[PDB]
């Protein structure tokens, strides 16, 4: 296979991890709209939403790790230029950085809503 197909998969799968989290938050906000805001409930929403974030961050770490694996398996391939493999590790770190940052944003956005 291709080095760039590793890059594709990583992004599609990371994008997928992230919209999964956003979607869980959108539905979460709708469930919260039918409940009276209370300080203890406000303490319960944040814990839930933060714990959801973590699940999403973990999903993304796993995509990177599997992409790194896929990058290494191409190592044992003469038909793959070994000197291009680093670049893939780098590319998947940049997507991870992006994915995590977008999760941090979506969380930050949400916590504002729960406390506002």
């Amino acid at each position, epitope marked *: 296979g291709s080095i760039s197909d590793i890059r594709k998969d990583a992004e599609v799968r990371m994008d997928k991890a992230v919209e999964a989290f956003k979607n869980k938050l959108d539905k979460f906000k709708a469930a919260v709209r039918k409940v009276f805001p209370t300080e203890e409930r406000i303490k319960d929403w944040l814990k839930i939403v933060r714990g959801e974030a973590e699940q999403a961050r973990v999903a993304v770490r796993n995509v990177g790790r599997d992409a*790194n*694996d896929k*990058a*290494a398996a191409l*190592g044992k391939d*003469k038909e*793959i*230029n*070994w*000197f*291009d*493999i*680093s*670049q893939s*590790l*780098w590319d998947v*770190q940049k997507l991870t950085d992006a994915a995590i940052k977008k999760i941090e944003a979506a969380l930050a956005d949400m916590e504002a809503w729960l406390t506002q």
Partner: antibody, heavy 123, light 109 residues
Framework: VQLVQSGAEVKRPGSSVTVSCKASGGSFSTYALSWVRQAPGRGLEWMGGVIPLLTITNYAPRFQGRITITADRSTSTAYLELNSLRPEDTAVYYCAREGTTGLGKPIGAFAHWGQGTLVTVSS | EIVLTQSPGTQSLSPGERATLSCRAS???????LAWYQQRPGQAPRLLIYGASSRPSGVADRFSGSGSGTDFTLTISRLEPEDFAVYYCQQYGQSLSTFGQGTKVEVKL
């Protein structure tokens, strides 16, 4: 980025040599580290390399069967083990690491070089 | 396997002259992954050019690289004395990286 190599070593034929190379500064896990040698008065020759994150190795066919390259991630140290030595293996062994653009994008070309380690195989 | 070949073997020039060094590959270098290194006596090689024409920061602009495919050139426009050294090309366009045999540029006094 600084690479520092182990010291000179005098070996007999049939012995193994293990050269060490520690990255000081820089990111280490993710950048390709190559070993490259130079026999007295002769050209540079590429031997092989390793990307440390998952020990992704790449050996030159002419050494396959004699060579092993590994990296210890905590100590930023890469390793060349050369087995079954012969007088033709008398060279200076340089560790060399790929350069970045500007952590930065990897370029392949060896931007960073160690001070070389002299291995003399003496009958 | 890609055999790289440098021409001429030796180069005898005065300071201020323009030196042009050749490197030719038996087959095409994958994605023009060719590097040019300078090695002064008793010293480890120094990267001058990469990806055929890219110059890394800190390398003087009198060094430049060009060519594609199987035919490559390094040019040193105005030799300074400290340029007396051996120059190798490298290709890393496939997993078996291989170097040229070397051009020695002799300056003069």
């Amino acid at each position: 980025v600084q690479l520092v190599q182990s010291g000179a070593e005098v070996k007999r034929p049939g012995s193994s040599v293990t050269v060490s190379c520690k990255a000081s500064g820089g990111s280490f896990s993710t950048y390709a580290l190559s070993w490259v040698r130079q026999a007295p008065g002769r050209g540079l020759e590429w031997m092989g390399g390793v990307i440390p994150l998952l020990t992704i190795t790449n050996y030159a066919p002419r050494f396959q069967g004699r060579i092993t390259i590994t990296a210890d991630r905590s100590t930023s140290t890469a390793y060349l083990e050369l087995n079954s030595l012969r007088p033709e293996d008398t060279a200076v062994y340089y560790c060399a690491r790929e350069g970045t653009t500007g952590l930065g994008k990897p370029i392949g070309a060896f931007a960073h070089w160690g001070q070389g380690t002299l291995v003399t195989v003496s009958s | 396997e890609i055999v790289l070949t440098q021409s001429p073997g030796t180069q005898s020039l005065s300071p201020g002259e323009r030196a042009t060094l050749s490197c030719r590959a038996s087959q095409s270098v994958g994605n023009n992954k060719l590097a040019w290194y300078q090695q002064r006596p008793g010293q480890a090689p120094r990267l001058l050019i990469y990806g055929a024409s890219s110059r890394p920061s800190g390398v003087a602009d009198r060094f430049s690289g060009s060519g594609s495919g199987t035919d490559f050139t390094l040019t040193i426009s105005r030799l300074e004395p400290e340029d007396f050294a051996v120059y190798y090309c490298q290709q890393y366009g496939q997993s078996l990286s291989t170097f040229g045999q070397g051009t020695k540029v002799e300056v003069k006094l």
